[PDB]
Scaffold this active site. Structure first.
Site, PDB file in Angstrom:
ATOM      1  NE  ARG A 162      -3.480   5.616   0.632  1.00 56.55           N
ATOM      2  CZ  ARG A 162      -3.296   5.287  -0.642  1.00 56.55           C
ATOM      3  NH1 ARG A 162      -3.056   6.228  -1.547  1.00 56.55           N
ATOM      4  NH2 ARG A 162      -3.354   4.016  -1.012  1.00 56.55           N
ATOM      5  CG  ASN A 163       0.413   4.529   3.672  1.00 54.39           C
ATOM      6  OD1 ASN A 163      -0.080   4.803   4.766  1.00 54.39           O
ATOM      7  ND2 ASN A 163      -0.161   3.689   2.817  1.00 54.39           N
ATOM      8  CG  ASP A 220      -2.001   1.095   1.115  1.00 56.41           C
ATOM      9  OD1 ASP A 220      -2.220   1.618   0.004  1.00 56.41           O
ATOM     10  OD2 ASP A 220      -2.617   1.426   2.151  1.00 56.41           O
ATOM     11  CG  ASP A 234       1.968   0.775   8.705  1.00 59.21           C
ATOM     12  OD1 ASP A 234       1.275   1.234   9.641  1.00 59.21           O
ATOM     13  OD2 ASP A 234       3.050   0.180   8.897  1.00 59.21           O
TER      14      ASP A 234
END
Length: 305
Positions: A171-172, A167, A185
């Site tokens: 945004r992480n 992922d 995460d």
């Protein structure tokens, strides 16, 4: 087939069968009274993620220490407790400058807590999306490559352990002073990034390689595809969502076209700030065959130089 969401909301990593530790967490539990609540980042099914301040952290430097805190519910099942403790063992192996670190735990009591480092300026999507490129605040192009280079080095390290993130996205990526980057995460747990996930499993389809969507095959090569999309975000200064003009259904439709590979697919276009050579390397991450995608070692070399 595969769910990526962890117990407290975030996404989990795909990890080999791990030898018992004999490296690890701190042997002493972290005092909970020293966690001053600030904000609720997100939540999962059996827990939540909080931002908290810590005063006198000796036990940036002058200001208080921001930390993310995974909190399992007190009424968590034994399966949920085992899952949470699997996450702990995984995060306890993470020791790299560009990866978040397990700072403490609260196991001997309830609720189970995981304390991890958090960066000063939040995640890179919110921070970068407010900047503009140098000829709001501004960022230079060498500093952009410096951000992308750190993300590459973080994944390169994860690659050496046989960890798969599953992922990766801006945004992480957490940002601090001086565009220091740490991969994390938490985004999957956040309402702020719901649009980045497709309910089913709940998946970040816009960053996933075609084999992740059509076969649920997550690998290091599929993290390179996500790194391709993430690099695109950075060079777009996080101004738009990948394939933002397409619906989530059209994004799955487009994955089938990567597999058919007859020209009906559509790739992300070259960001204005991106030279031709860097875009070409970006496109190599989106190769149909996993093996034709570059390794993080090679991506890190290009971006650092």
């Amino acid at each position: 087939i595969v769910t990526l969401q962890g117990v407290t909301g975030g996404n989990t990593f795909a990890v080999p069968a791990l030898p018992p530790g004999a490296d690890g967490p701190p042997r002493v539990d972290f005092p909970r009274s020293r966690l001053r609540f600030k904000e609720k980042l997100g939540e999962g099914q059996f827990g939540e993620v909080h931002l908290c301040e810590v005063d006198s952290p000796q036990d940036r430097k002058g200001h208080p220490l921001l930390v993310a805190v995974k909190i399992l519910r007190p009424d968590a099942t034994k399966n949920a407790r085992n899952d949470f403790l699997k996450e702990v063992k995984i995060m306890s192996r993470l020791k790299d400058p560009n990866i978040i670190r397990l700072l403490g735990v609260c196991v001997q009591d309830d609720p189970l807590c995981m304390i991890t480092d958090y960066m000063e300026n939040g995640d890179l999507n919110q921070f970068l999306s407010a900047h503009q490129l140098e000829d709001g605040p501004t960022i230079s192009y060498p500093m952009l490559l410096h951000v992308a280079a750190q993300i590459a080095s973080g994944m390169r390290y994860l690659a050496t352990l046989n960890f798969v993130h599953r992922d990766l996205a801006t945004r992480n990526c957490l940002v601090g002073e001086n565009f220091t980057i740490k991969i994390a995460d938490f985004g999957m747990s956040r309402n702020l990034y719901a649009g980045d996930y497709y309910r089913v499993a709940v998946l970040p389809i816009r960053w996933m390689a075609w084999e992740c969507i059509l076969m649920g095959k997550f690998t290091t090569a599929s993290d390179v595809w996500a790194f391709g999309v993430t690099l695109w975000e950075v060079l777009m200064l996080c101004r738009a969502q990948p394939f933002g003009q397409l619906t989530d259904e059209q994004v799955i439709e487009n994955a089938g076209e990567f597999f058919r590979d007859q020209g009906r697919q559509v790739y992300l276009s070259r960001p204005p700030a991106c030279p031709q050579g860097l875009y070409e390397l970006m496109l190599r991450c989106w190769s149909r065959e996993s093996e034709q995608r570059p390794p993080f070692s090679q991506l890190h070399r290009f971006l650092a130089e």
